[PDB]
Amino acid sequence: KTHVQLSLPVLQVRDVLVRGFGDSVEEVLSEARQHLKDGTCGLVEVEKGVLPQLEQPYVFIKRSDAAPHGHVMVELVAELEGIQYGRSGETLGVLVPHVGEIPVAYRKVLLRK
Secondary structure (H helix, E strand, O other), X not given: OXXXXXXXXXXXXXXXXXXXXXXXXXXXXXXXHHHHHHXXXXXXXXXXXXXXXXXXXEEEEEEOOOOHHHOEEEEEEEEEOOEEEOOOOOEEEEEEEOOOOOOOEEEXXXXXX
């Protein structure tokens, strides 16, 4: 399928144990997609002071359209030193590995895969 229905655990930035997916734009997008497929991906909602507490490169989920079955259609955009790789809509948050942190909520998304 070109899209996959996912429910992403929303983590508080100070709980996150693994604060990024790797060391290159290509690696973080790769690893983010693998964790999304394996159900081991969390979401941190972006507010003042969140991103400096996470590791670059960043992987964002961004709204790709204006929401089947409650699931917002999203795609991945990476960012490294202020340059984004991808073009999409509003940020829903930044993806991080999930290694068992307790979430505060779930974000239903339809991921363009």
